[PDB]
Amino acid sequence: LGHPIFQDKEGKELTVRRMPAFFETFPVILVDKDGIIRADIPFRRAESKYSIEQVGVTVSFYGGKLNGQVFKDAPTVKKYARKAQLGEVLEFDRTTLESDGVFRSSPRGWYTF
Amino acid sequence: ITTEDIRGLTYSQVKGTGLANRCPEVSEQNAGGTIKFADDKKYKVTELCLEPKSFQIEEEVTKRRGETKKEFVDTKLMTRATYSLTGIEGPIVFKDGGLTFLEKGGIDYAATTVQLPGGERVPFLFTIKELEGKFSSSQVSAGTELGGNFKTPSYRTGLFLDPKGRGGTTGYDMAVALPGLEADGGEGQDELFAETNKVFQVTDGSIEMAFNRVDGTNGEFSGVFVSEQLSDTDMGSKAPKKVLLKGIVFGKIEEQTGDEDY
Amino acid sequence: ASAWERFCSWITSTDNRLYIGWFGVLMIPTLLTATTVYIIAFVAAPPVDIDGIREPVAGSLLYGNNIITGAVIPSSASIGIHFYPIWEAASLDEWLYNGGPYQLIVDHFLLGVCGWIGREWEFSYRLGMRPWISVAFTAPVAAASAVFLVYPIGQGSFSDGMPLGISGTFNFMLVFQAEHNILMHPFHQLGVAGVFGGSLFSAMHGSLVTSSLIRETTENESANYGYKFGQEEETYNIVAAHGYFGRLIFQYASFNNSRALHFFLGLWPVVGIWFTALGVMTMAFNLNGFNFNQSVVDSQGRVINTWADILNRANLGMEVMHERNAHNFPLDLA
Amino acid sequence: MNVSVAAYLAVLLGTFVPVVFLVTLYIQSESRKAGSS
Amino acid sequence: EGTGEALGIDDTRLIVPVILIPVITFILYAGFASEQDNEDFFDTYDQRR
Amino acid sequence: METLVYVFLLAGTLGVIFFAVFFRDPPRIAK
Amino acid sequence: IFRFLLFIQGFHNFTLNPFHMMGVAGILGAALLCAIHGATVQNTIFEDGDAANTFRAFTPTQAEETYSMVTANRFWSQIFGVAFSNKRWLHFFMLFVPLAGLWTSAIGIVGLALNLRAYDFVSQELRAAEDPEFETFYTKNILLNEGIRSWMAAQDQPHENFIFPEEVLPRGNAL
Amino acid sequence: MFTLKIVVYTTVTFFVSLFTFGFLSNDASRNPNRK
Amino acid sequence: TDLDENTRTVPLDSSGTTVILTPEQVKRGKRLFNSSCGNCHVGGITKTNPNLGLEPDALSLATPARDNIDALVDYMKNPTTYDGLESIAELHPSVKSADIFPKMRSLSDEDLFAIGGHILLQPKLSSEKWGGGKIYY
Amino acid sequence: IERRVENSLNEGLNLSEAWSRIPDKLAFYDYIGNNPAKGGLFRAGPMNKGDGIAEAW
Amino acid sequence: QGMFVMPFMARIGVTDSWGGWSVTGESVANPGFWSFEGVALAHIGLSGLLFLAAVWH
Amino acid sequence: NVEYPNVPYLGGSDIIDVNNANVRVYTRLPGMYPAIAKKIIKRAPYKDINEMLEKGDFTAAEKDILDKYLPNLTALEPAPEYVIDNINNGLYR
Ligand code: CLA
Ligand code: CLA
Ligand code: CLA
Ligand SMILES: CC(C)=CCC/C(C)=C/CC/C(C)=C/CC/C(C)=C/CC/C(C)=C/CC/C(C)=C/CC/C(C)=C/CC/C(C)=C/CC/C(C)=C/CC1=CC(=O)C(C)=C(C)C1=O
Ligand SMILES: CCCCCCCCCCCCCCCC(=O)OC[C@H](COP(=O)(O)OC[C@@H](O)CO)OC(=O)CCCCCCCCCCCCCCC
Ligand code: HEM
Ligand code: OEX
Ligand SMILES: [Cl-]
Ligand SMILES: [Fe+2]
Known about the structure:
The structure is cut from a larger assembly and holds twelve protein chains of ten kinds. Chain C has helices spanning 3-11, 21-43, 92-97, 100-127, 133-155, 166-180, 186-211, 238-248, 258-284, 307-321, and strands spanning 71-72, 164-165.
């Protein structure tokens, strides 16, 4: 689907911090260029400072099939922040094999084990 | 049980006996009165206690996936002795062509649960919160009835978190235990939106209390009520079921003291 | 020559396949009741409102659990440590809603293991053997009473006892660590020493006895058949094992006496498990493990973290996430 | 419960094959003991 | 529960088994006891049954 | 359906325990 | 080491690992064997003296068993249904249990080296995702693991420079 | 509920009385060294 | 770094004047804080009313502002609500209410000074720990 | 069913009312899928596994 | 539903369940012991007792 | 609710949504927490801040404080999920 550039409300480029392999579940936080936290997907919405609603973020896609598309609603920004947490964002067929949405190990890991 | 008898009992006697959940009643000896609403005197309800004695749930007549016919069914209580509502109080005002009681306090809700034949559990919030009751006269006496509609809040509030840490006012906004499902760029976890999107929805109900005993000396009244409301929705995941409660009611009418701060 | 005398002879008979005795009179019915109710509740039981907040938790196989996740859920927190038999419930359905089977199973099982202690003493008396195997059994029982009974008493709720399952056992562990810091509590450390040393001495003793077995067997035959049941002679050379272990470390360390050796074998794990059971009994009343958080500060006075602080972070994560909907106030005093 | 389907075969056959192996090893041995006498 | 009845006896019916079953057991035990040599002894325990 | 397998395995373990307790090889002293 | 224990639990859910279960079974069973064997041997000792303290009544070089195997076998057979009848089997068993436990748990930790972890039961995760009233102690353990990870990562992995605001930290009501 | 209560009371009293009057029936003598 | 005077200089009055606490003063202030109010105010929080902590943000936004030694010391004898309209001496430890709060009976003016110095010194020691709560333990 | 609706029609009812009085169970019996002579030797399982679970008439 | 052995219970008396339902369609308020579940448990217990008697013989 | 566009005004921004904000947020504005916020939350649903000033029963000093902090205050559509938790939302510290 292409690279999701995260243009904040003004136009600064946010980036979603990537999930480390250790973490089964990682919070979605959008660090700045220097990396001070700018926006995130809050767990507790009350008294939220760095919500994407408050800061204001838009997802502009570059490359891929979703190229040249500029989504600027908060919901659709959040949905692709969740995807950008996992690195590059891709489309998947989960019906051919009835996939269950939990990651597996490659032959490298199974050989190693 | 009369109010005169509750005063006689100490807490040690009443504790652990189930009498605390039981709604009082006006004695037959002290009855036939008339709680007249004098003008130039603001009146209010107090101690409006409602004990439901029978619980019924509108269950589908069959487990067919398209079943539209439903009949109310007898239910037995999983929770024990928490059902009664006590202390409800409110101002009596001339909002419209007749007097009306506005609910503004008290315990005024009970998060009870029942089980139907077949073993299905229905939780519901038996409540009269925000009731707008209308008296059937300008004077409370035997045969007078107070009835109206009320707004039942959600069984779970926003701060409640489901087993996967999802709530209305807080919690995860995704099924964190399925990152591969959220990895998809086309749909993601859109299928689980109904369960992930926790919605606080306030439902409607109606109550019809009928006062069969009234006393002018104490301002007390007692009788029976039938109330209709909706059951728990699990923040919009479930479809609400209709709950029909019936039982007894006690209450008192006094003059507003100016310190109530309604 | 009296009916009561014949009954007492039969009960105290050393000819029954399984000895009953007078402690068995109390053990067998209680343990059988606990087994029956546990099996029935584990295979099929409705969800239980453990936390007293009308949020039932499933523990039975029929309600979507496996052997690892299945459990007999602790009682409801609304009950507290009130006695909750079947006859104190308005109906059996609401008895199962508030986790009464846990109370039934725990009470019957605790009485049964007490009867097992007494029955172990009893048979020994009939045998003419010395007592005290019973004393060793107490250490496992003490731990079971600490987790199933004393911890509810101290905390004031049978919801706080350990669930009768595998995943529930892990849950009880993590909550106990979050609330009490059992790992830093020295009695649990003594228990860890007890179990690790029990494994060490078991492996060592088995290795040395198996290593010095006297040759009584051919090459096409298992060495175990070199020992005949009820023989008078020793099946291995104590001198050889003792000398090998003396050369391994130093002569003075080895137990040249076999009776002292076996007393030490019976002593180390029993005392360790006694201490950890007592530690759980004391943390029931909130005498927690050590709290070295923010114990190192620089000259200015700002906290330099230690491993205690990093452990505190995990304890704090478990503390905040446990029972998410049960707490309405900042302190976890209950 | 969306459980696997070959897990049934895995569990049942991984229990069955060793169990019948042990039962055969016991029956063979006993038969031989009886035949010796 | 939490009412404070002695031995949980809220109904008077509960006492009939609680008092009688020990009494039948006591009666059966008395036949054993009356058959014993009930004189004193100077020992740690009685070896006579 | 997995409850069938779980129950069968637990019952089989209990049966093995029963047969081990009550149909053990009787200990006897050699000569 | 305590921090390692809780870190491995929070990030791998190592208690759910069946190989860890086999290992703790081996350890606790070995402690059990040690305790029962010590008690049984000390309590079926033959009367080889007239002193109440029976430790001195053993000679290292004696060719006689100092305790009754037959009496211990009778005791444990009629108390527990089964009992050792062979000393050599008993002492090999005492060896095998802890060693087997350690090797089994080693297999589990080798699995955890590659993040090949028995973290979750997928069936229950899917059911709880589609059924927000389905709760098990397993799901509570998963929530506790999430709490451990999120509240531990910032101070436990300072090289990562994790700044988790209070908004994103997974919490519960009140505490 | 009361029927179950009295049945459980009957059973508990029966076994407790058996235990009580059994250990009271000169249990100390039931050892292999008697006489 | 040492406990230099830059750390030990705290605001004294509302105008902006500062005062350099002595090491004896900060030691006594820490001991007095932990002994007299640590039970509720451990870590710069308020256990009984967590809406109002001892972090400098809350003290500065109080009416009167309590981000100085004189204002804190006045609070320890004339405590008031967060808006400074009602006296809470009957619900708060104060030297004027020490009979019902027996921990404030022995405190002198220098003790109150040291306690205020400890309160104002803490936030300089940590960026977020003082009044941060569990999140920064 | 035919004689029931016929005597209903003779009572003055119309086809809609006459057929509405026929119980769903009786109409369910008058259906070939309920016939035992329609299954198969290796078509295994409940009858609901074939045509389906009957919902309405 | 492919209920093979249950109709033989229902044929000669056992029409109720401990779960509060009946094959006749009515809802049972106070089911007795001899329900479907009770009959099943009784048969299992008889199986165990007969097994023990077989061992003794 | 995976989306709630009025989150910024719940206590995290410079503007406070009066209708469904917890009392704690008024600690940010000096002189309003214990007394003024009680009357703000009592008659919580307001059409706008003007109706709040008219309806809130404020004393003259309270009106002066509210005149100071008018630009920090707004009144959006009441949210039931947030109004129920306007005095105690479980957020302590
Ligand atoms: C390698 C690391 C390690 C080690 C060695 C231990 C060791 C121990 N932990 Mg653990 N623990 C660990 C890590 C570790 N822990 C961590 C990281 C945490 C933090 C989360 C904890 C938190 C923790 C807690 C909170 C507790 C323990 C406890 C224990 C003890 C459990 C064994 C026991 O007491 O059995 C003794 C024996 C028994 C409990 C069994 C009773 C047996 C009964 C009497 C009979 C049962 C009969 C049965 C039902 C039927 C038989 C069937 C028949 C067919 C055969 C032991 C000292 C527990 C303890 O000390 O309990 C007192 C305890 O409460 N640990
Ligand atoms: C009943 C409770 C229980 C029990 C019995 C165990 C048992 C075990 N756990 Mg633990 N564990 C528990 C609960 C429990 N766990 C819980 C609840 C958790 C989750 C919080 C964990 C988390 C956990 C982890 C993360 C790991 C274990 C591991 C182990 C194994 C440790 C083996 C050992 O003895 O290492 C002791 C160490 C050794 C034997 C190594 C060699 C030691 C040499 C010989 C020492 C020589 C010292 C020398 C003389 C110098 C001394 C100097 C002096 C100054 C000190 C063992 C199977 C480990 C494992 O699985 O390993 C495969 C492991 O990594 N557990
Ligand atoms: C004569 C007695 C009898 C009868 C009339 C029925 C009748 C029924 N049973 Mg069955 N059942 C029986 C005995 C009987 N059962 C026994 C003894 C058992 C215990 C094992 C079961 C276990 C059982 C279950 C678990 C279920 C049923 C169900 C059913 C229904 C569907 C039948 C079906 O699909 O068959 C299908 C039959 C076949 C595909 C094979 C039939 C043809 C022959 C006999 C094959 C012979 C092959 C031969 C042995 C060679 C094999 C070689 C090998 C190497 C592969 C039906 C009401 C189902 C139901 O609806 O339950 C609610 C269901 O789920 N039954
Ligand atoms: C509805 C139902 C049934 C519910 C059940 C639900 C539930 C949660 C299920 C539990 C599932 C369960 C069983 C899973 C267990 C899985 C698990 C982790 C298995 C571990 C297996 C594994 C391969 C581990 C490797 C380590 C291993 C070898 C351990 C073995 C442990 C073991 C058996 C140790 C011995 C224990 C023991 C009781 C010894 C008793 C010995 C005894 C009788 C002493 C006798 C004796 C002593 C003397 O000294 C002398 C002198 C004499 C003469 C003498 O006789
Ligand atoms: C009144 C109360 C009565 C309750 C009694 C209950 C007793 C339970 C019996 C268990 C023994 C099981 C068979 C063991 C196997 C067996 O037959 O062993 C019999 C074996 C006899 O060995 P011998 O020394 O005779 O063997 C020498 C020969 O092997 C030659 O090499 O004795 C032991 O090793 C038993 C000690 C371990 C006993 C613990 C065994 C593990 C128990 C765990 C059971 C699993 C529970 C899971 C259920 C899902
Ligand atoms: C030496 C003694 C104490 C000192 C110096 C002290 C300090 C303070 C300060 C400065 C405040 C105001 C915080 C702010 O404005 O944000 C405060 C408030 C408060 N303190 Fe303390 N305190 C002391 C003892 C205690 C103890 C022991 C308790 C409780 C057990 C307590 C409970 C409270 C409460 C309830 C308030 C009232 C806040 C309000 O209503 O505005 N304090 N304290
Ligand atoms: O429930 Mn079981 O658990 Ca002992 O703490 Mn308080 O309450 Mn709940 O919390 Mn943490
Ligand atoms: Cl709370
Ligand atoms: Fe040995």
